[PDB]
Amino acid sequence: SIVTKSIVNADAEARYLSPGELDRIKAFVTGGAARLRIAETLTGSRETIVKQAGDRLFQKRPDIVSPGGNAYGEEMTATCLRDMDYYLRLVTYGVVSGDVTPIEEIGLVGVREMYRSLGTPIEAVAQSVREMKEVASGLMSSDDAAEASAYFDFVIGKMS
Amino acid sequence: SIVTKSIVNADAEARYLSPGELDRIKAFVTGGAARLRIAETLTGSRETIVKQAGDRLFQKRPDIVSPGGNAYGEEMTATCLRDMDYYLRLVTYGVVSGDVTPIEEIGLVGVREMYRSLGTPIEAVAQSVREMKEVASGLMSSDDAAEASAYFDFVIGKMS
Amino acid sequence: MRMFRITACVPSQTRIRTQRELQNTYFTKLVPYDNWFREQQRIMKMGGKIVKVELATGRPGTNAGLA
Amino acid sequence: RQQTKVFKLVSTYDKVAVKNAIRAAYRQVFERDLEPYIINSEFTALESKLSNNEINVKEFIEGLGTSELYMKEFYAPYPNTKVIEMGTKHFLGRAPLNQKEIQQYNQILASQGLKAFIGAMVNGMEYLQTFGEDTVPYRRFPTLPAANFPNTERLYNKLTKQDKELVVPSFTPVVKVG
Amino acid sequence: WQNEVRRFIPQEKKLTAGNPMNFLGMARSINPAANTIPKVSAQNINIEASVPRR
Amino acid sequence: MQDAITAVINSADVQGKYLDGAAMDKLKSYFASGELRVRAASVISANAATIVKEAVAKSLLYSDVTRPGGNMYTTRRYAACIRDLDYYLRYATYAMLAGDASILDERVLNGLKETYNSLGVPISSTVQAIQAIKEVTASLVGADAGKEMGVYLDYICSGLS
Amino acid sequence: MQDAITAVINSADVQGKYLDGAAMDKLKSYFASGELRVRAASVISANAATIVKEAVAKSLLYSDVTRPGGNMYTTRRYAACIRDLDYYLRYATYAMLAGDASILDERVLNGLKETYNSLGVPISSTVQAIQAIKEVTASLVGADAGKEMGVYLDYICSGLS
Amino acid sequence: MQDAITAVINSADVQGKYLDGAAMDKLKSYFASGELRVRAASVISANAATIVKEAVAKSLLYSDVTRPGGNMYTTRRYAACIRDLDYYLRYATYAMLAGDASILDERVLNGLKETYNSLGVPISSTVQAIQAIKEVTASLVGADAGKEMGVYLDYICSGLS
Amino acid sequence: MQDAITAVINSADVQGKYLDGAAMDKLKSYFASGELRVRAASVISANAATIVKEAVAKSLLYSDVTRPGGNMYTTRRYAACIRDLDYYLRYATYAMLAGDASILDERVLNGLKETYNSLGVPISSTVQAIQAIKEVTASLVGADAGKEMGVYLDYICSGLS
Amino acid sequence: AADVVPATIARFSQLNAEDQLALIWFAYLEMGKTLTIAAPGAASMQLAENALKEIQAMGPLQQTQAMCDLANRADTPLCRTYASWSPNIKLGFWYRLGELMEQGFVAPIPAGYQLSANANAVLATIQGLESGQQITVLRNAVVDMGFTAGKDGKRIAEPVVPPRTKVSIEGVTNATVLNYMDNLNANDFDTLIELFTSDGALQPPFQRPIVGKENVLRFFREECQNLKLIPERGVTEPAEDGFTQIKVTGKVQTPWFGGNVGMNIAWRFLLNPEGKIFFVAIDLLASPKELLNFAR
Amino acid sequence: ASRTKVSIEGVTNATVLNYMDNLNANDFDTLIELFTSDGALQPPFQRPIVGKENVLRFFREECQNLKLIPERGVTEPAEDGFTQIKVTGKVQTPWFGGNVGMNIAWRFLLNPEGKIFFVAIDLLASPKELL
Ligand SMILES: *[C@@H](C)[C@H]1/C(=C/c2[nH]c(/C=C3N=C(/C=C4\NC(=O)C(CC)=C4C)C(C)=C\3CCC(=O)O)c(CCC(=O)O)c2C)NC(=O)[C@@H]1C
Ligand SMILES: *[C@H](C)[C@H]1/C(=C/c2[nH]c(/C=C3N=C(/C=C4\NC(=O)C(CC)=C4C)C(C)=C\3CCC(=O)O)c(CCC(=O)O)c2C)NC(=O)[C@@H]1C
Ligand SMILES: *[C@H](C)[C@H]1/C(=C/c2[nH]c(/C=C3N=C(/C=C4\NC(=O)C(CC)=C4C)C(C)=C\3CCC(=O)O)c(CCC(=O)O)c2C)NC(=O)[C@@H]1C
Ligand SMILES: *[C@H](C)[C@H]1/C(=C/c2[nH]c(/C=C3N=C(/C=C4\NC(=O)C(CC)=C4C)C(C)=C\3CCC(=O)O)c(CCC(=O)O)c2C)NC(=O)[C@@H]1C
Ligand SMILES: *[C@H](C)[C@H]1/C(=C/c2[nH]c(/C=C3N=C(/C=C4\NC(=O)C(CC)=C4C)C(C)=C\3CCC(=O)O)c(CCC(=O)O)c2C)NC(=O)[C@@H]1C
Ligand SMILES: *[C@H](C)[C@H]1/C(=C/c2[nH]c(/C=C3N=C(/C=C4\NC(=O)C(CC)=C4C)C(C)=C\3CCC(=O)O)c(CCC(=O)O)c2C)NC(=O)[C@@H]1C
Ligand SMILES: *[C@H](C)[C@H]1/C(=C/c2[nH]c(/C=C3N=C(/C=C4\NC(=O)C(CC)=C4C)C(C)=C\3CCC(=O)O)c(CCC(=O)O)c2C)NC(=O)[C@@H]1C
Ligand SMILES: CC1=C(/C=C/C(C)=C/C=C/C(C)=C/C=C/C=C(C)/C=C/C=C(C)/C=C/C2=C(C)C(=O)CCC2(C)C)C(C)(C)CCC1=O
Numbered sequence A, B: 001s002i003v004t005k006s007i008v009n010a011d012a013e014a015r016y017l018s019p020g021e022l023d024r025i026k027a028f029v030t031g032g033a034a035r036l037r038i039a040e041t042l043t044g045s046r047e048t049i050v051k052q053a054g055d056r057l058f059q060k061r062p063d064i065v066s067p068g069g070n071a072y073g074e075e076m077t078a079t080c081l082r083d084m085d086y087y088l089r090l091v092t093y094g095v096v097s098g099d100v101t102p103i104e105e106i107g108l109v110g111v112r113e114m115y116r117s118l119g120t121p122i123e124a125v126a127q128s129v130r131e132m133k134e135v136a137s138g139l140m141s142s143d144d145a146a147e148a149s150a151y152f153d154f155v156i157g158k159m160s
Numbered sequence C: 001m002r003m004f005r006i007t008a009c010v011p012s013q014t015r016i017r018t019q020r021e022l023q024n025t026y027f028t029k030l031v032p033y034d035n036w037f038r039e040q041q042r043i044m045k046m047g048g049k050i051v052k053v054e055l056a057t058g059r060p061g062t063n064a065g066l067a
Numbered sequence D: 001r002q003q004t005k006v007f008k009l010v011s012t013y014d015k016v017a018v019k020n021a022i023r024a025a026y027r028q029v030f031e032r033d034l035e036p037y038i039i040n041s042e043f044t045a046l047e048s049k050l051s052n053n054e055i056n057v058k059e060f061i062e063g064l065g066t067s068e069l070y071m072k073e074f075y076a077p078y079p080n081t082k083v084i085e086m087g088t089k090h091f092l093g094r095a096p097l098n099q100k101e102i103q104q105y106n107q108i109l110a111s112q113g114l115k116a117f118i119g120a121m122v123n124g125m126e127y128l129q130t131f132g133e134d135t136v137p138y139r140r141f142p143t144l145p146a147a148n149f150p151n152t153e154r155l156y157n158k159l160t161k162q163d164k165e166l167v168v169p170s171f172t173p174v175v176k177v178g
Numbered sequence E: 001w002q003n004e005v006r007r008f009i010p011q012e013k014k015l016t017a018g019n020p021m022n023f024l025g026m027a028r029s030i031n032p033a034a035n036t037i038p039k040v041s042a043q044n045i046n047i048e049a050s051v052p053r054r
Numbered sequence F, G, H, I: 001m002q003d004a005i006t007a008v009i010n011s012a013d014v015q016g017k018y019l020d021g022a023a024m025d026k027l028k029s030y031f032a033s034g035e036l037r038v039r040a041a042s043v044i045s046a047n048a049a050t051i052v053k054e055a056v057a058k059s060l061l062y063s064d065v066t067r068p069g070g071n072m073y074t075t076r077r078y079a080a081c082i083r084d085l086d087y088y089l090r091y092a093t094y095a096m097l098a099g100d101a102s103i104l105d106e107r108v109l110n111g112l113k114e115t116y117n118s119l120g121v122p123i124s125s126t127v128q129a130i131q132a133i134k135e136v137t138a139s140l141v142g143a144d145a146g147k148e149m150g151v152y153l154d155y156i157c158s159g160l161s
Numbered sequence J: 001a002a003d004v005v006p007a008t009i010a011r012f013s014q015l016n017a018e019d020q021l022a023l024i025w026f027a028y029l030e031m032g033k034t035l036t037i038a039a040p041g042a043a044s045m046q047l048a049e050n051a052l053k054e055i056q057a058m059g060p061l062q063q064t065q066a067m068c069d070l071a072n073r074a075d076t077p078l079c080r081t082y083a084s085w086s087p088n089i090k091l092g093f094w095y096r097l098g099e100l101m102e103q104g105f106v107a108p109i110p111a112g113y114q115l116s117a118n119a120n121a122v123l124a125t126i127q128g129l130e131s132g133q134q135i136t137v138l139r140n141a142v143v144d145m146g147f148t149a150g151k152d153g154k155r156i157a158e159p160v161v162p163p164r165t166k167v168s169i170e171g172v173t174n175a176t177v178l179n180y181m182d183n184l185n186a187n188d189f190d191t192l193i194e195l196f197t198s199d200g201a202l203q204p205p206f207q208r209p210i211v212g213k214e215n216v217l218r219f220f221r222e223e224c225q226n227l228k229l230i231p232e233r234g235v236t237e238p239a240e241d242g243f244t245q246i247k248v249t250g251k252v253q254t255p256w257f258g259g260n261v262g263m264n265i266a267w268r269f270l271l272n273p274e275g276k277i278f279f280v281a282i283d284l285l286a287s288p289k290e291l292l293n294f295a296r
Numbered sequence K: 001a002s003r004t005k006v007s008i009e010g011v012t013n014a015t016v017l018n019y020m021d022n023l024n025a026n027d028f029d030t031l032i033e034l035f036t037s038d039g040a041l042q043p044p045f046q047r048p049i050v051g052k053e054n055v056l057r058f059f060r061e062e063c064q065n066l067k068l069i070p071e072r073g074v075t076e077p078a079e080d081g082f083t084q085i086k087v088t089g090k091v092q093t094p095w096f097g098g099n100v101g102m103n104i105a106w107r108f109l110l111n112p113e114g115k116i117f118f119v120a121i122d123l124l125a126s127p128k129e130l131l
Helices: A002-013 A019-044 A046-060 A074-097 A101-107 A111-117 A122-138 A142-159 B002-013 B019-030 B032-044 B046-060 B074-095 B101-108 B111-118 B122-139 B142-159 C033-045 D015-030 D044-051 D057-065 D068-075 D080-092 D099-111 D113-122 D125-131 D148-156 E021-030 F004-014 F021-059 F075-098 F102-107 F113-119 F123-141 F143-160 G004-014 G021-046 G048-060 G074-098 G102-107 G112-119 G123-141 G144-160 H004-014 H021-046 H048-059 H076-098 H112-119 H123-141 H144-160 I004-015 I021-046 I048-057 I075-098 I102-107 I112-119 I123-141 I144-160 J004-014 J017-030 J049-057 J060-071 J077-083 J087-103 J117-128 J131-143 J175-185 J189-193 J213-222 K014-025 K028-034 K052-062
Strands: C004-009 C026-031 C049-054 J201-203 J229-238 J244-252 J264-271 J279-284 K035-042 K068-077 K083-091 K102-110 K116-124
Touching: A002 A019, A002 H004, A002 H076, A019 A046, A019 A074, A019 A142, A019 H021, A019 K052, A046 A074, A046 A122, A046 E021, A046 K035, A074 A101, A074 A122, A074 A142, A074 E021, A074 H004, A101 A142, A101 G074, A101 H004, A111 A122, A111 G048, A111 G074, A122 A142, A142 F021, B002 B019, B019 B032, B032 B046, B032 B074, B032 B142, B046 B074, B046 B122, B074 B101, B074 B122, B074 B142, B074 J131, B101 B142, B101 F075, B111 B122, B111 F021, B111 F075, B122 B142, B142 G021, C004 C033, C026 C033, C026 D057, C033 C049, C033 D113, C033 D125, C033 F102, C049 F113, D015 D044, D015 D057, D015 D068, D015 D080, D044 D057, D057 D080, D057 D113, D057 D125, D068 D080, D068 D113, D080 D099, D080 D113, D080 D125, D080 D148, D099 D113, D099 G074, D148 H112, F004 F021, F021 F075, F021 F123, F021 F143, F075 F102, F075 F123, F075 F143, F102 F143, F113 F123, F113 F143, F123 F143, F123 J049, G004 G021, G021 G048, G021 G074, G021 G123, G021 G144, G048 G074, G048 G123, G074 G102, G074 G123, G074 G144, G102 G144, G112 G123, G112 G144, G123 G144, H004 H021, H021 H048, H021 H076, H021 H123, H021 H144, H048 H076, H048 H123, H076 H123, H076 H144, H112 H123, H112 H144, H123 H144, I004 I021, I021 I048, I021 I075, I021 I123, I021 I144, I048 I075, I048 I123, I075 I102, I075 I123, I075 I144, I102 I144, I112 I123, I112 I144, I123 I144, J004 J117, J004 J131, J017 J060, J017 J087, J017 J117, J017 J131, J049 J060, J049 J077, J049 J087, J060 J077, J087 J131, J117 J131, J175 J189, J175 J229, J175 J244, J175 J264, J189 J213, J201 J213, K014 K028, K014 K068, K028 K035, K028 K052, K035 K052
Parallel strands: J201 J279, K035 K116
Antiparallel strands: C004 C026, C004 C049, J229 J244, J244 J264, J264 J279, K068 K083, K083 K102, K102 K116
């Protein structure tokens, strides 16, 4: 998380955490209540968030489910929903932790090798995470929308 | 050309070409007539083989030309036809060279980055070059099937 | 193999080295094409100035035969 | 750590110094004098290029790494992990830093081979910050990170071809992700 | 005199989070819109101007 | 490299006097612009690969450059051009964060113009590609940050010119 | 390392003798293998990613191995095991075309068990990974070539197991 | 490395579940402790040199190690011990601020035992110096911050022991 | 091995301190739980022979494990499997009487993981079998006693995990 | 034929801005059932929400003005922004505009418009062709649209069309409620500020009641804009102290706090026995459709 | 009161009566199994809350020991097989304002199966103002 990031950055220079790092951790720990509440909100709408996220994705890129696509039947669409819930959980992990590194530790390192060995169009995965961001921001406060959109946007960028 | 590869290896070893290399270029030069025949046959029947393999690729992967795919739109399917033409011409160049260096350095090295930028499903192109392989084997002689299939297999494996 | 020759001046920004340093401060070296991007990125990140660069070996625009 | 010599090619005018630096680079990269391992010196072109000062000592070291002899000696008869250990010992002067470095170098050795590994490990920022553009690489005695010193000591305390075991196969992760 | 006739099949292993079985019905809940078979043959396309040129 | 704060500090230090009213006014201006710069940086970090994609598409694809005989021909040179534009976009974003053109001068333009001349790269084509970068990033970040990002991209083009 | 041809050469040379009839006939046997081995190598190289892809899809994929807690979880370890299977397939092809397992135990078996134990990799799961690789190769190389693929991959498993 | 905030994440993700009430409560507990953790880390960083000086004074100075022939002799070696104690204190501060002692066994304890064995370092002497540092810091940072720092330093010592 | 009472006594002895308020509160908690633990022990020793029957029937019957090729085929393997389940049940009952996980650390989990690994027996299937015996024992011993049994069984699984 | 799509593009070329826009809109209407379906994810629409949000937030008359400026390729910032996009981006933008019009988020077509004869022939030609060259024709038609500095021109500009009845409530005939609900459809909020007392009690849906006449004026000026209300029926009862409680249910043909073109909306009125309007409560009755949910 | 069946006129279904009884007993964990997984709650002066644990949260930090007194109700069919039940009662506990004298309206959109896919808590207001 942000504490882990600060510790690693300080370890790189072989020094104690600077006052900037210390009061950044200060602000993060003080404001963690809002982050935990937003993680709770994202967790609660998990089934629906995945539901209309996948619906909008398929309406936007039906080729992934069309004849020739990676996920033709309800079985492979279910696998897409499974991966979709995976990356929703990853974004929740990032929100609670406050830093993107756990996402990198979980669902961003070697992802291109994953979705090349599987034939999945990674651009479609990015679009699905973008549908995450759009609908989730629709179902939450604007400032909280931006707070979650930071991690959704980072996942989108690592996609493309 | 295998002559360039052998010269490169000898220069790396700082030695004159070994008997294996000399025999390699000797067999290549003595058998250049068959490679030229393959090149002429591919050039003459390029337009039909590319169209047939593209049709078979469509039959395997209709989503590529579905409304929302990279090949959708007659412009965006003519561009697939042109890309298959380019790869067939590259294979023809390699057949008359004896090695895969021109294939590697004209359309293979950095192909993944280009097809990621354009969004093309590289595995679909692998299936397309496979279909080119079956079409060429059908139109071309049995003994030369091994020689042509070696290069097609190399292109498929590297670009898969 | 399409070689570059680069004349670059890399100063010292942190340490005052007490021995002779023109051998690595202002140098004209040979760098391959494949290594050149990484080499120039390293030189720029080290604060040096690329005084000059040229393609001593190779022909520009060679579609095939770049070994 | 103190009873050693560092070869800096200060000037190429002194041909004797250039030859001494070349021989020291051979010894460091290959761990031995390459008299009984070659029919004839295949690095004569690199020696001439360095003697004319058209390339730096770092380029000479990279050319030594990107040579058929090195892949015959320290790449062909060992797995990728042992190749990583031996390469980081010969050029960077120390054992692998961590599992991240091992993962990266395994990625290069799996995607582009030994030449890309040598080029990345030689053109890296650590190489330039330690040896510069004129110093032949030498054995290092790092204090950090953790376990780097013991791994380097084990790597350098055994003669060439002493054993086939892996001094640093991989760092056991205290915390396993997922 | 009820009797428990235990069947051949092993007891069905409890569904876990990783398995997409719990999402399977959701997929049928989705019922994603598929796509019709594209009716293009590529024979009547001629690669001199059908390819984009901009 | 330098940023707005470092640039102001160096400008004050070269004549060796303290930060006067003008310097702190400039510092206030940069601090005010920092919010917009961070937001635009987030957007560009979102859509860098896209912006490169439609930039090349509206500037390079299906043109005299990509066709055989052009410098962008072949997958190798295409990947090289894609990486060039990716690095240009990333460094323009870096300069936008810093508010200073020093990073472009000492990290993007030293050794690049004559590198292209040695390779024969079309300077007039890369200029239009960077201008496509400008327009695409303006369409996303908005006009307010778009103008400053265009300023940095124009600096890159002028240095390359 | 060494293969069957180098095997006969160094077997003759350790005794300091020429090619006796026994070496003559084993060279005849290896030459008779010949085109079959190289054709199998070419067919393996053709769909090189395909063998590993369907091998993962058959045994490892969609299970507790690839689920949370399993060593397959996260994209990093998935790509790592894909790279491991690529090593295994390439080295099996090298041993096949050479006809000897010296390459395997000089480039794979040395410390691979201990290096997985350091990472806590499932030896058994890798075992059926190479097992599935066996029939995925056999379905594309035939029976006899597939048989020798099975033999060498079984040697790899036994060294690993 | 792992901290108190990502420890819950990994614990929940090994079974693949989301963050439930228990994980939420653990995160809130860590955030509550964050105030004291940050204050202790800042105070320790401000007084690290004096802390290591005082710990060396009451645990190593004027003993057999510092006398000639001892491992504290040869002032380079004394500076090596000063550096080692600084490392131990800084990494203990890292672990205390993180809330988990995973960085200690990943960046400190990894390979330390055979390091000291090869160098012939007095392991118990270093352990005693670590408890001296623990006592010095506990008397300067308070009772609870000293509690956590002593916990992590004792974990380091137990790794040493 | 130590129970809750002896564990508390040893913990107090480590600090050289008397039994403070926490000591008496933990002791009284164990004394209150003693009634439930004794009755659950009687109930579980009641059906220790039969309980493992349905524990394995709903876990490891008519599956890949029992069939030939599986690691539970052959009378020795099935007998060792049922005996391992009996050992786990008996030792978890021992821990429930003692109310401490100390016995499992040294007498059950000590050397069990690598023992299974060398034996090649499926550790994951053992985990599911121990979970199944968890529900089976919870059915007969009740809810609270069931939870106490289940925590120890999950500890065994985690150690074997 | 091989020249089906180039000939169709040439046919589209001579059609004027009015004919071109009408053909595009009617092709979108025929989309899915007769023309090719739309998959907007294929094009990078993430660089286009700026213009779409700007057009949505902008008012209906000048919405149509900006759209027709694009159609005739006027020199406006929106025109240049559209012209700087790729053809797939342009087509996705047009499809998003069509979806907004279908959902009513943007000003729709003139009521009861009929396609021209030439445009009808070109659209039928589009319908006959395959999906691939249909999408090609649409792309080539939309690429040239927009202002690009260079050699381009238009023959005749397509000017925006320069262009209200009393609402009937079943079971209710109160003059005050009718004036309120007619003026809002006519956007006559200034009349309403004198049409109710100074209490200012309004109840936005899924919100707390607003208090204060100035707050009510801000809500009317900020929230209510071009709202189209069609009351279906209503009931009036005598509340406490002679107050009139009027529950009137109808529909709103405009996006309104996440509301569709067809939505069962209800109004509860506490009107003063001697005054006019003491409290108004607007509630969007639920159904098997919920896109305005925010969870918590 | 709480132990006896809630006296509601026009409502004769076990689901609504069970929901009344559970809400009075405050066993919200037992209360919410009557809810649908996609089911939502429409709080007064707030937009609908979707997600099962979201309704759990709304119960366990907002609906904290409140008493509701239903009076009457009506039921009719709804599209997609849903059943629209409009129930009116009075709230005798402080719940978002209007102590004792607020008419709460519950709009139960029941699933054809029986679970409540959507329930809306409508706090109908008396002539009392300043709410
Ligand atoms: C007075 C003339 C100066 C002075 C000296 C001073 N030194 C100490 C303490 C120590 N001095 C050493 C030095 C060495 N140890 C070595 O091994 C080597 C040679 C290889 C040296 C030079 C050490 C290790 C100590 C501390 C440990 C020990 O004494 O055994 C003191 C006392 C410090 C204290 O607080 O006890 C003093 C006074 N100090 C000055 O200010 C003068 C410049
Ligand atoms: C000082 C009175 C004047 C002055 C000098 C100045 N020099 C530098 C930097 C360098 N000077 C050298 C020169 C040498 N290095 C060698 O090894 C030898 C031969 C044995 C020579 C002659 C070099 C190589 C550098 C750059 C590398 C380095 O710093 O080690 C500076 C600093 C420049 C900077 O900021 O980078 C200065 C100031 N400048 C004046 O104004 C004086 C008249
Ligand atoms: C067809 C079955 C697949 C496919 C193809 C496709 N390609 C493009 C565009 C381009 N293709 C290339 C490729 C090459 N140029 C070269 O020089 C070489 C070697 C000689 C190759 C392989 C290039 C450079 C382009 C860019 C356009 C241009 O050439 O100017 C497209 C268009 C994509 C777009 O967004 O416009 C398509 C559709 N796409 C698929 O989905 C199939 C798998
Ligand atoms: C794309 C917009 C244009 C284009 C690109 C192109 N570039 C190369 C080769 C190189 N480009 C670089 C670039 C950089 N080095 C740096 O340090 C920086 C700072 C980020 C940059 C931008 C380098 C170093 C090279 C050479 C090394 C390498 O390519 O790896 C090529 C290939 C040329 C050739 O193969 O001969 C191309 C095609 N080409 C165009 O036409 C566009 C205008
Ligand atoms: C869906 C809209 C897109 C898509 C996805 C897709 N994925 C799979 C299969 C798998 N996905 C994963 C990914 C992960 N597992 C992990 O543990 C992690 C981190 C937590 C990741 C990222 C895996 C491992 C699989 C393999 C099966 C398994 O989960 O065990 C499929 C099905 C592939 C198949 O052929 O079975 C699909 C369809 N594909 C698309 O085209 C969409 C854009
Ligand atoms: C895959 C078949 C199974 C699996 C394995 C797995 N491996 C790793 C990590 C590594 N594996 C290797 C492999 C090799 N090293 C060698 O020297 C040889 C011979 C060339 C081989 C095959 C290496 C080097 C690593 C570490 C470096 C890296 O990541 O590239 C992991 C990840 C371990 C971790 O996260 O620490 C895994 C999971 N997992 C399965 O499920 C398969 C049954
Ligand atoms: C049953 C759930 C699983 C299973 C069991 C199985 N175990 C063995 C062999 C052994 N089991 C043990 C374990 C213990 N012995 C002890 O004294 C204790 C202390 C508490 C334990 C935990 C040991 C030591 C062995 C080896 C010696 C023996 O033969 O018993 C086998 C047979 C192994 C073999 O090679 O014969 C089996 C089959 N197998 C499964 O598949 C189940 C998941
Ligand atoms: C499938 C697919 C896609 C393509 C998708 C496609 C095909 C997208 C295209 C969708 C289309 C064709 C949308 C049409 C939009 C037309 C509008 C909004 C015009 C309205 C005109 C009005 C209101 C004028 C009214 C009027 C006024 C006011 C007057 O003044 C009087 C008259 C008049 C009528 C003029 C993608 C590109 C997204 C991805 C790839 C891919 O394969």
